[PDB]
Amino acid sequence: SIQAFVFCGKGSNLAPMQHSTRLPKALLPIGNRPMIEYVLDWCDQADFKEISVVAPVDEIELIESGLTSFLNSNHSHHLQDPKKINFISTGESLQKELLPRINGDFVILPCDFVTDIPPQVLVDQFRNRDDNNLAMTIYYKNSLKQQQFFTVYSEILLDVYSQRDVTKTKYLQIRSHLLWNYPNLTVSTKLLNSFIYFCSFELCQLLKLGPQSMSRQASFKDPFTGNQQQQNPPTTIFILPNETLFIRANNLNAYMDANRFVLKIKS
Amino acid sequence: PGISSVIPTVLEQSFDNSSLISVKELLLNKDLIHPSILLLTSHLAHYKIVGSIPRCIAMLEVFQIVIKDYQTPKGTTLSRNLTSYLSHQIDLLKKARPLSVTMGNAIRWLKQEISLIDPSTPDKAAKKDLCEKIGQFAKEKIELADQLIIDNASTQIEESTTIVTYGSSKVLTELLLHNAISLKKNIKVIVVDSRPLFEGRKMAETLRNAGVNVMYALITSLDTIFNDVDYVFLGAHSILSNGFLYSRAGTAMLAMSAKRRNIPVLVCCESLKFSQRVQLDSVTFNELADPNDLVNIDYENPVERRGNKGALLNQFIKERKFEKKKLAMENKPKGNKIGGKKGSEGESKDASNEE
Amino acid sequence: HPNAATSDVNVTIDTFVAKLKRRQVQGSYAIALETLQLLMRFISAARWNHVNDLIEQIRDLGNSLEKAHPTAFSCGNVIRRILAVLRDEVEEDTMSTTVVAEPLISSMFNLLQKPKTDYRQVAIQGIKDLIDEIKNIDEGIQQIAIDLIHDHEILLTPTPDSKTVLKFLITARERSNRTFTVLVTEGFPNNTKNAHEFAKKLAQHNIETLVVPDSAVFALMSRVGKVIIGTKAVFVNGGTISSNSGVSSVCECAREFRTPVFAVAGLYKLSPLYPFDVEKFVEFGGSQRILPRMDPRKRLDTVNQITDYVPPENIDIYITNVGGFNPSFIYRIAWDNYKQIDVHL
Amino acid sequence: EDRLQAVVLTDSYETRFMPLTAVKPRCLLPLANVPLIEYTLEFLAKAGVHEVFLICSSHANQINDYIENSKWNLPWSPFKITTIMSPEARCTGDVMRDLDNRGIITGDFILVSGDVLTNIDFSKMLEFHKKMHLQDKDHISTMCLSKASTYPKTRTIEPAAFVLDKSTSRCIYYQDLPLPSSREKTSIQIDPELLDNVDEFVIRNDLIDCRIDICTSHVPLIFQENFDYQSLRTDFVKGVISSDILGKHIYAYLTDEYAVRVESWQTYDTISQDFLGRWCYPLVLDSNIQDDQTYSYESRHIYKEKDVVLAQSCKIGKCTAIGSGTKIGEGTKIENSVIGRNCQIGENIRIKNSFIWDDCIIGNNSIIDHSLIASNATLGSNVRLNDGCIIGFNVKIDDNMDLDRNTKISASPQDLDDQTLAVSIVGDKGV
């Protein structure tokens, strides 16, 4: 009924520490408290019993050791290593592999996290509002160019379109059928997606018959398009994505943000 | 078990017959609690749609699911801790929000069933026949009863009828729908609704979705539509062995008005809604929710606004209480239609021995 | 007579009309004040010397105003009062100009059988008198009100809006030893904000507040002691039109459970027109403040009314500056300041 | 903020109303008995205008007459009306240019494009406009918006698009798409020059069209400077925004209250229906603004004026209105309809969401389901119609008729079907 999957990889995007042979992505002490400490705390808070961490080809026992020693844990965590990983796919290929182990509804939570939010309320929202998928976006750093853009609603709070700025045509484009049902659609500049994902019971059917997703974003939320043609078989409650906004200073790490997180932590 | 007490709102000098709050947002739940019960509790806490009849059905379904999920342990027998579990569940329900007479009856029946089958029969074969029998019971003491109610209504209700109601009683909705589309007639159906809930509104919506001419009504002026109105059903919940109706909202007022102006008021019921417990006023046993339901400026339900309202302790003493369940009278609801077909509420327990 | 001279002769007639029609004006008292001011303006600049003609003109003016708005009556009433004031004076004057007693103040059979001065100054004074009356009704109601409230008694108050009623309540509350608890219905469509304001005011003084849903009166009435209203319009056979929402059902409940019903009243607020049907006098309300969005409105039919009418079968006393009077009697009071001729203008 | 002057656009979108307009024009027409410019005039009065400019062109004489008959040619009000002359069927730029040539205004002025029925208090808006102006010099005009009637699925012809701001509230873009009638275009392209200067963005498509502007002393000069502009919404404001004058901003404002501009038949019908419901509060028939109207609110959602006569045994529905001087025999099964002042009826009218205008004579027997009858257009015997039908001026409909959906009916004594002279779609006679 209640399970969580913990994504782990390798520091491909980070610049100046991660290229050393014995230090992993999961175990990174950047601001005193460890990177997977916070995740573990979150999991504990979330009342989730059985949690399994997905591990890459690099580091197989180090993560296990981390899970075991130093740390409160008191839970039956299991560290599993599937073989189909190439990175050129971060976690989609792992997700595709682990599917008969999912008995209920699963939650996706990467190893690299910075958190300050009240966490119960996301879970509760996921449970209540009869929704298949829900994600999170949080404010840009407020302390003293080309960026990223997301779609939002404010009355129900829904998501529709999620595309960035790296690989697209120069002018901004909107579809016709993707407005005539669900009229009001607001676009925001400031928001940073924390990459936290929730998944319902009926999702396992698609990843064993026809894969398309890249970096866990492509064929997940945007294939909600039940308009124009109707040519991809849907699994029945309609295919609908959701999103919620929060205020506190905590976000994703991808670029030069680690050094800023250091500055943040001591408060 | 969890967290109890430590909550806002005063004891209230006016009306304190039952306690007022509980568990809404989940943390540190026991490692044996079935999720269906939890979800139901979450629903009921902020529920719009259900009231009396469907709730019981839902509960039954949940119980059936639990039974399906349950198997006889190696150490403890089939009747060892089941009863305890049931009791715990009931206590949780009570903590969440007080319950109905039908529910109690169902619980009693379950208990009886527990006793009936001896702890020696094959375990797989036991629950096989159990779930069948429960299903049968559900069919008979709800669906069959509903059918019977419908048929009762059919013989009595005239060629072309204007029907005025209050609430969200599913039976009545079904009846209305039947009249609209199945047997086919002219139906001017008027529904009334209060401030905190939107039951009436929901019913109207449903009727629209089936295609009916509806009038949407409120408290401030009922009379303006009567002064014409010919036939009226009330929001049935529970009958006592006096001959009254423990029911929802200012239905009593409406009934009084009906009594004053020409026509009797009538009610349909299920032959398991009846109690054997009794009371006689809107002070006896009050059903309460939080005074937070009326802070927001109306229109919709989830809004979040800034204005003036939001004082339960801030200003110099401010109590903003209400009621959900009140007393409907006796001399006026002459009509009752059940699983035993006919009778008066003056004949308050003439089917309670017949069962 | 139409509005042909009455535009440049007097300044703000059009503005007054606008206020009436489009409801720029707020408060019955305020309306009355405005009417008085208009009358003053009419008097001051314009000259007549001929009296009956003038009276007729005034009647016509009043009539037109009344016809402009079929549920605001204060304006009409003030005018009627002024007419009455004038008429008696005129009658007195006639008897001096030319140069029998009745069993009481007025006879009945005189209607079937055949029966320069400082008058302008007197007329001026009349308006001033009226103004003063309007100002200090409460200083005349005050010591008639604190004659019927006791200790350990629950007091119901639907439709609490006016500055009069509030003041009355405050005066009672000043004698804090007199024990009374206040139940206040919110009043669904329009009264809500006003009710809240009233509650706040009560709290300010230290008066015990209980906020009531309108559906829930049957559950409270058996515990309710005395009920006070603060009406807008008072009528012939005893009933009232009160400032919006939840009064009819309440009254019915009271009748059923037998409950005492006070009403704060004023004779200038009292109308001598008889209400005969629900089909006319009851004023309806806006669906705008019920449900947003208009595509569900295609099939359903929302029914709502602002201000409501009361049958006299229920209320029992009218606490005025003069005194508390019986509903099946108040006609006499009205006639002690109004006529049978000044009705259908 | 005292002393105000306004420019009003009546006569704009004829032929858009296709069955009507031949002798009597577009803006003069009634809603439920009452003409449409009257509401605009009332609004103007409420605002506090002292100098009124109005445009007349097509069927202009009658409009002028009606204006004269209205109570504003008399100097009792703070304002007077004057007529601007222009050629038959024109755009809005020419008129602007003409006005500029004439040259009167000193400060802030108003332009009301189209036909607007607004119940909204505007003093506060004016104050806000003033405050905004006091912020910075290079600032022009104010624009109004509102949350739509539920979901835009019945309102098909208007697909208005707006891209706005939170902090200062500023728009750039506008777009139109048909969709469920003919599925074609699926692409819109957006301005990428200036974005991080503003930061906050709110994009909305489900907003009600009104077409109103509070304007400062810049617009006519601008029009003079760039004479390529044709309309204000489609080209002008957008052009101004797109680096025309460096640093020149405009204003956006939201109000949840009911305010709709009319343009089509179904929209008009919807507006009528809304009015029938108590959606409008500073505008109801019992208040009687004209001082010659004597309508009052009644039970079961029916409107009535003084003196209405009917014959015995009846059956009535909801959201209806019956005017003064209506002489009705036995019948009328009334559901959702307008009938104007003075309507003589023989016997029986089965009414299911119908419509009847000023002064109509209906003969014997008619089954009517969602259709409109115009002024003086007399109905003979046996009238049977279907959905969305529209009848024009002076249509002397005679004996025996059958028509279905979308069948438009003429007005002239030129292009369309159902002729005004003897028998319509049972004989070809007329001009």
UniProtKB/Swiss-Prot annotation, chain A:
Renumbered to this chain, the signal peptide range is none
What are the Phosphoserine sites (modified residues) in this protein?
215, 219
Modified residues annotated as Phosphothreonine in this record: 225
Q: Where would you find this protein in the cell? A: Cytoplasm, Cytosol
Domain of life, per lineage: Eukaryota
Please report which protein family the annotation says this sequence is part of: Belongs to the eIF-2B gamma/epsilon subunits family.
What does the record note on quaternary structure? Component of the translation initiation factor 2B (eIF2B) complex which is a heterodecamer of two sets of five different subunits: alpha, beta, gamma, delta and epsilon. Subunits alpha, beta and delta comprise a regulatory subcomplex and subunits epsilon and gamma comprise a catalytic subcomplex. Within the complex, the hexameric regulatory complex resides at the center, with the two heterodimeric catalytic subcomplexes bound on opposite sides.
Described purpose of this protein according to its UniProt entry: Acts as a component of the translation initiation factor 2B (eIF2B) complex, which catalyzes the exchange of GDP for GTP on the eukaryotic initiation factor 2 (eIF2) complex gamma subunit. Its guanine nucleotide exchange factor activity is repressed when bound to eIF2 complex phosphorylated on the alpha subunit, thereby limiting the amount of methionyl-initiator methionine tRNA available to the ribosome and consequently global translation is repressed.
Cite any additional comment in the entry.
Present with 9530 molecules/cell in log phase SD medium.
Q: What is this protein called?
A: Translation initiation factor eIF2B subunit gamma
Q: Which gene encodes it?
A: GCD1
Q: Which residues of the full protein are shown?
A: 2 to 413 of 578
Swiss-Prot record, chain B:
Provide the protein's localization.
Cytoplasm, Cytosol
Residues annotated as transmembrane: none
Q: Which BP terms does GO give this entry?
A: cytoplasmic translational initiation; regulation of translational initiation
Q: Which UniProt keywords apply?
A: Acetylation, Cytoplasm, Initiation factor, Phosphoprotein, Protein biosynthesis, Repressor, Translation regulation
**Quick one: where's region Disordered?**
328-355
Could you name the Gene Ontology cellular component terms for this entry? Answer: cytosol; eukaryotic translation initiation factor 2B complex; guanyl-nucleotide exchange factor complex
List the biased-composition ranges (Basic and acidic residues): 342-352
Q: Can you tell me which residues the record assigns to a coiled coil? A: none
Q: Which GO terms describe its molecular function?
A: enzyme regulator activity; translation initiation factor activity
SUBUNIT field: Component of the translation initiation factor 2B (eIF2B) complex which is a heterodecamer of two sets of five different subunits: alpha, beta, gamma, delta and epsilon. Subunits alpha, beta and delta comprise a regulatory subcomplex and subunits epsilon and gamma comprise a catalytic subcomplex. Within the complex, the hexameric regulatory complex resides at the center, with the two heterodimeric catalytic subcomplexes bound on opposite sides.
Q: Give the family per the record.
A: Belongs to the eIF-2B alpha/beta/delta subunits family.
Tell me what else is known: Present with 10300 molecules/cell in log phase SD medium.
Kindly provide the name given to this protein in its UniProt entry: Translation initiation factor eIF2B subunit delta
Origin species, per record, is Saccharomyces cerevisiae (strain ATCC 204508 / S288c)
Which residues of the whole protein are included? 237 to 593 of 651
UniProtKB/Swiss-Prot annotation, chain C:
Query: Where found, per UniProt?
Result: Cytoplasm, Cytosol
One biological process term from GO is:
cytoplasmic translational initiation
Chief localization class? cytoplasm
Disulfide partners: none
One family name in Pfam for this protein: IF-2B
**SUPFAM superfamilies attached to this UniProt entry:** NagB/RpiA/CoA transferase-like
Q: Which GO terms describe its molecular function?
A: enzyme regulator activity; translation initiation factor activity
Q: Provide the alphabetized UniProt keywords.
A: Cytoplasm, Initiation factor, Protein biosynthesis, Translation regulation
* Annotated Gene Ontology cellular component terms: cytosol; eukaryotic translation initiation factor 2B complex; guanyl-nucleotide exchange factor complex; mitochondrion
Describe its function: Acts as a component of the translation initiation factor 2B (eIF2B) complex, which catalyzes the exchange of GDP for GTP on the eukaryotic initiation factor 2 (eIF2) complex gamma subunit. Its guanine nucleotide exchange factor activity is repressed when bound to eIF2 complex phosphorylated on the alpha subunit, thereby limiting the amount of methionyl-initiator methionine tRNA available to the ribosome and consequently global translation is repressed.
Q: What else is known?
A: Present with 6650 molecules/cell in log phase SD medium.
Member of which family? Answer: Belongs to the eIF-2B alpha/beta/delta subunits family.
Q: What is this protein called?
A: Translation initiation factor eIF2B subunit beta
Give the originating organism. Answer: Saccharomyces cerevisiae (strain ATCC 204508 / S288c) (Baker's yeast)
Curated annotation (Swiss-Prot), chain D:
Give the GO biological process terms. cytoplasmic translational initiation; regulation of translational initiation
GO terms for molecular function, please? guanyl-nucleotide exchange factor activity; translation initiation factor activity; translation initiation factor binding
Where it sits in the cell: the answer is: Cytoplasm, Cytosol
Alphabetized UniProt keyword annotations:
Cytoplasm, Initiation factor, Phosphoprotein, Protein biosynthesis, Translation regulation
Q: Which domain of life is it from?
A: Eukaryota
| UniProt miscellaneous comment | Present with 33800 molecules/cell in log phase SD medium.
Which family would the database say this protein is a member of?
Belongs to the eIF-2B gamma/epsilon subunits family.
Instruction: Report the function annotation for this chain.
Output: Acts as a catalytic component of the translation initiation factor 2B (eIF2B) complex, which catalyzes the exchange of GDP for GTP on eukaryotic initiation factor 2 (eIF2) and is regulated by phosphorylated eIF2. Its guanine nucleotide exchange factor activity is repressed when bound to eIF2 complex phosphorylated on the alpha subunit, thereby limiting the amount of methionyl-initiator methionine tRNA available to the ribosome and consequently global translation is repressed.
Record's protein name: Translation initiation factor eIF2B subunit epsilon
* Species per Swiss-Prot/TrEMBL record: Saccharomyces cerevisiae (strain ATCC 204508 / S288c) (Baker's yeast)
